[PDB]
Amino acid sequence: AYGDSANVFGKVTNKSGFVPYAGDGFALLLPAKWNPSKENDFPGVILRYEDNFDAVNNLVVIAQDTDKKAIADFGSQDKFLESVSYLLGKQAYSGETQSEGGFAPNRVSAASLLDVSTTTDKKGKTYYKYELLVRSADGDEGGRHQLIGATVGSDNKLYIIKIQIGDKRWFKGAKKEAMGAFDSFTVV
């Protein structure tokens, strides 16, 4: 029981709302109110934090070993997302339906790509950053916002970040936590 004084009348140590993280080969600023989840959704998960309030709001990094050195070697950004389309999940309902509203027939979920970019960092490597809104037939959370970013590191390993935020929480302030984590993602 080491005796350190209580912080009476003292200055705070963290009002940023972000915690700096350093895994293996990457570094990012996690949302400070999020906590580690013991879930492996995908093959290649290193860390996966989720929100304390609801488990829909979460992020995950994925480190796949690859044979290619640049992210342009995976093709263009449109041809890249169709390869890594497993990030958005799979429709486990192979039932036939035409009564869900705002969807194609037999589709109970429809991802919609809203933004792409080709931003880089001070090392020179370009990233493929994505912004989706995945709606469902029940329409939980008012939809789900996806923030996918991917790059290949200096060890031929594909690092993919995916920040998922429910749309209900998105306009209520989880855009600041997600975009601040999404811009902070740098693979060294």
């Binding site: 169709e82 389309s85 497993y86 799979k90 809203l114 933004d115 306009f171 855009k175 600041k176």
Partner: protein
């Protein structure tokens, strides 16, 4: 078991999508959130909508009056016209101080013509609303010959 499907919607944010997301984050000022800063900062976007507002008045409002469509003429005067009061202050706040009183004086009587046209459209008086509209278009051209 099938994967989810994508859709090319990367141009909806270019048109109109990220507009209700700007009106819901409580870090922006409300003049940024209500669309008030963006109207004051870009003069041509007000100059676009004011010429659009007279296109809804000089051509689109008389048609509902001879066919006596009142609730489509009450709200013709409020839907896209519903920014014209805020717009005619921004276009009049770019002038000289003796030109602004000439601008805001003409702008004040065009308000008194629309609010008299609204009351004419409220008691369904077609002989008055067709007469109050010609007064309204004359006071409209007097403001728009002053602020632009």
């Amino acid at each position: 078991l099938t994967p989810v499907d994508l859709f090319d919607d990367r141009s909806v944010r270019d048109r109109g999508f990220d507009l209700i997301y700007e009106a819901r984050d409580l870090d922006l000022p409300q003049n940024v959130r209500e669309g008030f800063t963006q109207a004051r900062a870009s003069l041509d976007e007000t100059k676009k909508r004011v010429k659009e507002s007279e296109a809804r008045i000089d051509a689109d409002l008389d048609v509902f009056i001879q066919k006596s469509y009142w609730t489509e003429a009450r709200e013709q005067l409020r839907r896209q016209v519903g920014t014209l009061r805020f717009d005619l202050n921004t276009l009049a706040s770019t002038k000289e101080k003796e030109a602004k009183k000439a601008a805001l004086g003409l702008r004040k009587e065009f308000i008194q013509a629309v609010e008299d046209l609204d009351f004419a459209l409220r008691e369904k008086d077609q002989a008055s609303a067709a007469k109050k509209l010609e007064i309204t278009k004359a006071k409209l051209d007097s403001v728009l010959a002053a602020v632009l």
